[PDB]
Structure formats: structure tokens, C-alpha cells
């Protein structure tokens, strides 16, 4: 029931450094399925309560890998927030995955 | 919470160009008469 100055005076401090795309669903801790390495994603400024990604990211994917659900990070090395993409997608030779956004959001 | 992201395409940016060269060959000597039909001894009268 937080309120709109409420919610943005909250995700201020999240700030999420770090994203890691996973094969399947990730677990209460998500440490296996690992596909890709680790990459920076630079977030944006709360309004009306929810942060977006700011950069189009784009992660190596290796061969033979599928790609269904991701894991944000922060800078001490803690799973923030999982979720899954809207279009999975299977790597059958080396290629490049492109998110064009993530969006934290608390409206709902 | 939502989480939910979403998906772009894959756009990307390079520069090319193809280049060529060039280099003129000549081959001459200095002229020491040069071939003649009926090459035949004269006798030149005035």
C-alpha cells in the first residue's frame, strides 16, 4: 500500500549492476544453469515507481545453449530479482543474445 | 513486483572499405634503325 513518493524513495537504493541469463527457471538462489557470463547493466533514475534498463545490453551466448530466464545482480554479489524473457531462444551456433530492456517495476 | 523484461533485435555497426592500387610499366631503348621491308643494299644518286 506504499505511496508513489514512498515507492521511488525505495528502489533509489537497489540499483542492480549485474545481469546473468539462465536455461531454466531459477531457484530460490539461483547458482546452477549459468549460461552466460556475467555482464554490467547500467539502470536508470525511479519515476512513478519503477526502474528500467537503460542500455541495450548484449550478451555472448555459447553453443548449443537455450536461453529462458535471467537473474539481475547487484555489486556485492547477490541475486537481486529473477524473472523470465518474453521469447526464449535456442543457440545452435555462437551468436550474440540482445535484451532491449528490463523494467523493475511496483505498480502491480 | 513485476521483474519482467523484454527482447530487441541485434543492430550492429561496421565500417568497410576496399582498396586498390595501380603501377605503369615501360619498356623502351633507344632507336638503332628498326624493321624495314625489302632490306636491300642502295646506291643513292642526286
Redesign the interface.
Known amino acids: 500500500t506504499l505511496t508513489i513518493d514512498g515507492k521511488n524513495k525505495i528502489l533509489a537504493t537497489l540499483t542492480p549492476t549485474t545481469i546473468v541469463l539462465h536455461n531454466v527457471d531459477p531457484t530460490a538462489d539461483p547458482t546452477a544453469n549459468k549460461v552466460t557470463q556475467p555482464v554490467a547493466i547500467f539502470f536508470s533514475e525511479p519515476n512513478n515507481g519503477l526502474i528500467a534498463s537503460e542500455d541495450?545490453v548484449?550478451i555472448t551466448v555459447p553453443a548449443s545453449a537455450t536461453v529462458s530466464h535471467?537473474s539481475?545482480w547487484d555489486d556485492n554479489s547477490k541475486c537481486v530479482?529473477?524473472?523470465?524473457?518474453?521469447?526464449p531462444q535456442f543457440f545452435a551456433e555462437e551468436g550474440?543474445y540482445?535484451?532491449?530492456?528490463?523494467?523493475?517495476?511496483?505498480n502491480? | 513486483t513485476r521483474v519482467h523484461s523484454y527482447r530487441g533485435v541485434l543492430i550492429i555497426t561496421d565500417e568497410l572499405t576496399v582498396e586498390a592500387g595501380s603501377r605503369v610499366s615501360l619498356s623502351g631503348y633507344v632507336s638503332d634503325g628498326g624493321t624495314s621491308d625489302v632490306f636491300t643494299i642502295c646506291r643513292l644518286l642526286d
Not at chain 1, 81 to 86: E, K, N, P, Q, V
Open positions: 541495450t548484449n535471467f539481475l530479482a529473477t524473472g523470465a524473457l518474453s521469447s550474440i540482445v535484451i532491449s530492456s528490463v523494467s523493475i517495476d511496483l502491480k
